[PDB]
Amino acid sequence: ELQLVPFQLGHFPILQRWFATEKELVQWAGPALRHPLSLEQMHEDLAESRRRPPLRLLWSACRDDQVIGHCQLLFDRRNGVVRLARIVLAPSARGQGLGLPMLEALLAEAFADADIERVELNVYDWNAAARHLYRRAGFREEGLRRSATRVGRERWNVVLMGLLRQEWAAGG
Numbered sequence: 005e006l007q008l009v010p011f012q013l014g015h016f017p018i019l020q021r022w023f024a025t026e027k028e029l030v031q032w033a034g035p036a037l038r039h040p041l042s043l044e045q046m047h048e049d050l051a052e053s054r055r056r057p058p059l060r061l062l063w064s065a066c067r068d069d070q071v072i073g074h075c076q077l078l079f080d081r082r083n084g085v086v087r088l089a090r091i092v093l094a095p096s097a098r099g100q101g102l103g104l105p106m107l108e109a110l111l112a113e114a115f116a117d118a119d120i121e122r123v124e125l126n127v128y129d130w131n132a133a134a135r136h137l138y139r140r141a142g143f144r145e146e147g148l149r150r151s152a153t154r155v156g157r158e159r160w161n162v163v164l165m166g167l168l169r170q171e172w173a174a175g176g
């Protein structure tokens with residue numbers, strides 16, 4: 005069904021189209037982002053993926069040839085922790101139970117290296133869709149970082165969540 009393949013610039017025009025406004029970019033990728041999404045805005049992230057070993061891995065979720073989502077992994081190899089980030093489905097792919105398959109695939113990649121013992125993520129407290137999806141995928145809420153992210157005149161709270169390898173294995 006859904007496949008995760010390495011992200012490539014060849015997929016950038018598809019990805020760029022999923023964000024209509026600055027706010028949608030910020031929700032996805034944080035307060036540094038500006039609309040339209042541009043390759044220049046992704047340079048630091050992509051360079052992280054060219055380090056050896058790689059600090060970030062970027063992924064495109066595809067169905068056959070069609071790019072329908074994006075996700076990232078950030079590696080803390082000293083501690084054996086990976087952070088999930090920048091998870092999005094194309095707007096036309098939302099509401100079709102593709103959220104969970106994408107998370108399950110991403111988790112598989114995160115735990116592929118046997119030295120990873122923990123996976124984690126941040127989610128804005130108001131991002132109810134994302135938060136429920138993460139819980140369904142087996143993530144436990146671990147805390148709430150108050151007034152952490154500045155966006156305009158607002159400050160957003162960040163829910164922290166985590167999943168241990170033995171929990172991930174127990175669930176599947």
Ligand SMILES: CC(C)(COP(=O)(O)OP(=O)(O)OC[C@H]1O[C@@H](n2cnc3c(N)ncnc32)[C@H](O)[C@@H]1OP(=O)(O)O)[C@@H](O)C(=O)NCCC(=O)NCCS
Nearest residue numbers: 032090091092093098099100102103104132133134136137
């Ligand atoms: C987060 C995202 C990947 C989820 O996609 P999806 O799985 O199709 O999400 P949906 O819109 O179907 O909602 C998913 C689930 O949450 C539940 N849910 C709870 N509150 C919800 C809300 N406000 N809207 C939609 N679903 C909600 C749904 O019922 C569904 O679960 P169920 O089958 O158990 O009922 C998608 O919304 C997205 O790409 N959003 C924009 C980017 C973003 O916010 N990224 C996350 C942080 S980077």
